[PDB]
Amino acid sequence: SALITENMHMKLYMEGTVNNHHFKCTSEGEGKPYEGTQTMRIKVVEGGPLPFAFDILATSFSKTFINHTQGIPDFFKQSFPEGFTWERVTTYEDGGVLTATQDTSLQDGCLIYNVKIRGVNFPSNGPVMQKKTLGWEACTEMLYPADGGLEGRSDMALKLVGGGHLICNLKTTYRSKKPAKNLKMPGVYYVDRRLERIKEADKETYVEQHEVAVARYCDLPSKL
Protein backbone atom coordinates (compact mmCIF):
# COMPACT_ATOMS: atom_id res chain seq x y z
CA SER A 1 0.00 0.00 0.00
CA ALA A 2 2.66 2.57 1.00
CA LEU A 3 5.31 2.39 -1.74
CA ILE A 4 7.67 5.11 -0.59
CA THR A 5 8.90 3.70 2.72
CA GLU A 6 11.06 5.19 5.51
CA ASN A 7 14.26 4.04 3.82
CA MET A 8 14.58 3.99 0.03
CA HIS A 9 17.44 2.94 -2.28
CA MET A 10 18.56 4.43 -5.59
CA LYS A 11 20.21 3.35 -8.85
CA LEU A 12 20.99 5.96 -11.51
CA TYR A 13 22.34 6.08 -15.06
CA MET A 14 23.34 9.38 -16.70
CA GLU A 15 24.64 10.27 -20.16
CA GLY A 16 25.45 13.54 -21.82
CA THR A 17 27.76 16.10 -23.35
CA VAL A 18 29.17 19.37 -22.03
CA ASN A 19 30.49 21.79 -24.59
CA ASN A 20 31.87 19.03 -26.79
CA HIS A 21 32.85 16.42 -24.26
CA HIS A 22 30.83 13.20 -24.03
CA PHE A 23 30.52 11.20 -20.80
CA LYS A 24 28.52 8.69 -18.73
CA CYS A 25 27.93 8.21 -15.00
CA THR A 26 26.27 5.78 -12.70
CA SER A 27 25.36 6.22 -9.09
CA GLU A 28 23.87 4.33 -6.26
CA GLY A 29 22.61 5.51 -2.89
CA GLU A 30 19.99 5.61 -0.22
CA GLY A 31 18.00 8.16 1.75
CA LYS A 32 15.05 8.70 4.03
CA PRO A 33 12.26 10.21 1.85
CA TYR A 34 10.18 11.76 4.68
CA GLU A 35 13.17 13.27 6.41
CA GLY A 36 14.28 14.65 3.05
CA THR A 37 17.86 13.39 3.33
CA GLN A 38 19.83 11.32 0.86
CA THR A 39 23.24 10.20 -0.28
CA MET A 40 24.48 9.29 -3.76
CA ARG A 41 27.79 7.53 -4.52
CA ILE A 42 28.63 8.47 -8.10
CA LYS A 43 31.09 7.03 -10.63
CA VAL A 44 32.18 8.65 -13.92
CA VAL A 45 32.23 5.52 -16.05
CA GLU A 46 32.95 7.03 -19.45
CA GLY A 47 34.85 10.14 -20.61
CA GLY A 48 36.68 10.88 -17.37
CA PRO A 49 38.50 12.80 -16.14
CA LEU A 50 35.87 15.38 -17.15
CA PRO A 51 37.38 18.66 -18.38
CA PHE A 52 34.79 20.65 -16.39
CA ALA A 53 33.89 21.20 -12.77
CA PHE A 54 31.62 18.43 -11.49
CA ASP A 55 29.46 21.01 -9.63
CA ILE A 56 27.52 21.71 -12.84
CA LEU A 57 26.11 18.19 -12.78
CA ALA A 58 25.24 18.19 -9.06
CA THR A 59 21.59 19.28 -9.35
CA SER A 60 21.02 16.42 -11.81
CA PHE A 61 21.49 13.36 -9.61
CA SER A 62 16.08 13.36 -6.54
CA LYS A 63 12.70 14.93 -5.89
CA THR A 64 11.21 12.03 -3.93
CA PHE A 65 13.39 12.79 -0.89
CA ILE A 66 11.83 16.12 0.15
CA ASN A 67 10.28 16.59 3.61
CA HIS A 68 6.81 17.83 2.74
CA THR A 69 5.90 19.50 6.01
CA GLN A 70 2.61 21.16 6.97
CA GLY A 71 0.62 18.59 4.98
CA ILE A 72 1.74 20.16 1.72
CA PRO A 73 0.47 17.75 -0.91
CA ASP A 74 3.44 15.77 -2.17
CA PHE A 75 3.33 15.73 -5.98
CA PHE A 76 6.35 13.46 -6.29
CA LYS A 77 5.51 10.83 -3.69
CA GLN A 78 1.94 10.69 -5.00
CA SER A 79 3.08 9.91 -8.53
CA PHE A 80 3.94 6.37 -7.65
CA PRO A 81 3.93 3.64 -8.65
CA GLU A 82 3.87 5.34 -12.06
CA GLY A 83 6.60 7.83 -11.20
CA PHE A 84 7.42 11.18 -12.84
CA THR A 85 9.79 13.26 -14.93
CA TRP A 86 11.60 16.57 -14.75
CA GLU A 87 13.19 18.72 -17.40
CA ARG A 88 15.37 21.70 -16.57
CA VAL A 89 17.31 24.61 -18.06
CA THR A 90 20.09 26.01 -15.91
CA THR A 91 21.42 29.29 -17.21
CA TYR A 92 24.78 30.50 -16.00
CA GLU A 93 25.37 34.25 -15.96
CA ASP A 94 28.70 33.79 -17.76
CA GLY A 95 27.20 32.10 -20.81
CA GLY A 96 27.07 28.42 -19.94
CA VAL A 97 23.73 26.74 -20.39
CA LEU A 98 22.79 23.27 -19.18
CA THR A 99 19.55 21.44 -19.99
CA ALA A 100 18.73 18.06 -18.52
CA THR A 101 15.78 15.72 -18.82
CA GLN A 102 15.05 13.05 -16.23
CA ASP A 103 12.88 9.95 -15.67
CA THR A 104 12.03 8.52 -12.24
CA SER A 105 10.47 5.07 -12.15
CA LEU A 106 9.89 2.68 -9.24
CA GLN A 107 10.91 -0.97 -9.69
CA ASP A 108 11.16 -3.74 -7.08
CA GLY A 109 11.27 -1.18 -4.28
CA CYS A 110 14.16 0.71 -5.86
CA LEU A 111 14.06 4.23 -7.28
CA ILE A 112 15.51 4.32 -10.79
CA TYR A 113 16.70 7.60 -12.29
CA ASN A 114 17.58 7.97 -15.97
CA VAL A 115 19.24 11.31 -16.76
CA LYS A 116 20.43 13.10 -19.91
CA ILE A 117 22.69 16.20 -19.98
CA ARG A 118 23.31 18.85 -22.69
CA GLY A 119 25.63 21.75 -21.88
CA VAL A 120 26.81 24.39 -24.34
CA ASN A 121 28.77 27.61 -24.38
CA PHE A 122 30.62 27.23 -21.08
CA PRO A 123 33.43 29.73 -21.57
CA SER A 124 36.73 27.89 -22.03
CA ASN A 125 38.57 30.26 -19.72
CA GLY A 126 35.69 30.34 -17.24
CA PRO A 127 35.70 29.02 -13.68
CA VAL A 128 33.76 25.94 -14.74
CA MET A 129 36.17 24.81 -17.44
CA GLN A 130 39.24 25.87 -15.47
CA LYS A 131 37.98 23.92 -12.39
CA LYS A 132 37.85 26.79 -9.89
CA THR A 133 34.59 25.71 -8.19
CA LEU A 134 34.00 24.91 -4.48
CA GLY A 135 30.45 23.56 -4.51
CA TRP A 136 27.10 25.26 -4.01
CA GLU A 137 25.45 27.52 -1.48
CA ALA A 138 22.09 26.47 -0.08
CA CYS A 139 19.03 27.64 -2.03
CA THR A 140 15.27 28.13 -2.11
CA GLU A 141 13.18 26.68 -4.95
CA MET A 142 9.71 28.03 -5.63
CA LEU A 143 7.25 25.43 -6.87
CA TYR A 144 3.91 26.32 -8.39
CA PRO A 145 1.21 24.41 -10.25
CA ALA A 146 1.20 24.93 -14.03
CA ASP A 147 -0.62 22.95 -16.74
CA GLY A 148 -1.48 19.94 -14.58
CA GLY A 149 2.20 19.72 -13.65
CA LEU A 150 4.49 21.68 -11.32
CA GLU A 151 7.11 24.27 -12.19
CA GLY A 152 10.25 25.17 -10.26
CA ARG A 153 12.20 28.41 -10.22
CA SER A 154 15.46 29.04 -8.35
CA ASP A 155 18.76 30.94 -8.33
CA MET A 156 21.89 29.18 -7.17
CA ALA A 157 25.36 30.40 -6.14
CA LEU A 158 28.48 28.45 -7.12
CA LYS A 159 31.38 29.25 -4.82
CA LEU A 160 34.69 30.07 -6.43
CA VAL A 161 38.28 29.65 -5.43
CA GLY A 162 39.06 33.19 -4.32
CA GLY A 163 35.84 33.95 -2.45
CA GLY A 164 33.51 34.86 -5.29
CA HIS A 165 30.34 33.33 -6.70
CA LEU A 166 29.09 32.55 -10.24
CA ILE A 167 25.29 32.71 -10.29
CA CYS A 168 22.88 30.58 -12.25
CA ASN A 169 19.12 30.30 -12.65
CA LEU A 170 16.99 27.19 -12.99
CA LYS A 171 13.70 26.65 -14.80
CA THR A 172 12.21 23.23 -14.13
CA THR A 173 9.06 21.55 -15.37
CA TYR A 174 7.89 18.56 -13.36
CA ARG A 175 5.43 16.14 -14.94
CA SER A 176 3.65 13.24 -13.28
CA LYS A 177 3.27 9.92 -15.10
CA LYS A 178 0.08 9.47 -13.01
CA PRO A 179 -3.42 10.50 -14.23
CA ALA A 180 -4.28 13.98 -12.90
CA LYS A 181 -7.57 12.56 -11.61
CA ASN A 182 -5.61 10.74 -8.90
CA LEU A 183 -3.32 13.62 -7.84
CA LYS A 184 -4.05 16.32 -5.27
CA MET A 185 -2.06 19.38 -6.44
CA PRO A 186 -0.20 21.65 -3.93
CA GLY A 187 -0.48 25.46 -3.83
CA VAL A 188 2.53 27.70 -4.33
CA TYR A 189 5.27 26.60 -1.92
CA TYR A 190 9.00 26.67 -1.22
CA VAL A 191 11.73 24.01 -0.84
CA ASP A 192 14.86 24.84 1.17
CA ARG A 193 17.71 22.75 -0.04
CA ARG A 194 21.33 22.09 0.95
CA LEU A 195 23.39 20.14 -1.59
CA GLU A 196 26.89 19.22 -0.44
CA ARG A 197 29.89 17.25 -1.69
CA ILE A 198 30.99 14.70 0.92
CA LYS A 199 34.05 13.12 -0.66
CA GLU A 200 35.89 12.82 -4.00
CA ALA A 201 38.62 10.70 -5.50
CA ASP A 202 40.56 10.55 -8.76
CA LYS A 203 39.86 13.98 -10.26
CA GLU A 204 36.15 13.80 -9.58
CA THR A 205 35.68 10.47 -11.30
CA TYR A 206 34.28 9.38 -7.93
CA VAL A 207 32.01 11.73 -5.96
CA GLU A 208 29.82 11.34 -2.90
CA GLN A 209 27.02 13.86 -2.64
CA HIS A 210 24.41 14.65 0.04
CA GLU A 211 21.20 16.62 0.11
CA VAL A 212 18.81 17.83 2.74
CA ALA A 213 15.56 19.31 1.38
CA VAL A 214 12.50 20.60 3.29
CA ALA A 215 9.28 22.04 1.76
CA ARG A 216 7.28 24.76 3.46
CA TYR A 217 4.71 27.47 2.87
CA CYS A 218 5.95 31.01 3.54
CA ASP A 219 5.83 31.23 7.34
CA LEU A 220 5.65 35.03 7.68
CA PRO A 221 2.50 36.81 9.00
CA SER A 222 -0.08 37.78 6.39
CA LYS A 223 -2.57 40.66 6.30
CA LEU A 224 -4.98 39.30 3.67
Numbering used by the authors: 2 to 62, 66 to 228
Please share excerpts from the published article on this structure.
The chromophore in the crystal structure of mKateS143C adopts only the trans-conformation at neutral pH, consistent with the proposed role of S143 in stabilizing the cis-conformation and the spectral properties of the protein.
Fluorescent proteins have facilitated major breakthroughs in modern molecular cell biology. Structural characterization of mKate under different conditions revealed the pH-dependent trans-cis isomerization of its chromophore, a discovery that further aided the development of mKate variants with enhanced optical properties. Using a structure-informed approach, we introduced a minimal set of two mutations in the chromophore environment of mKate.
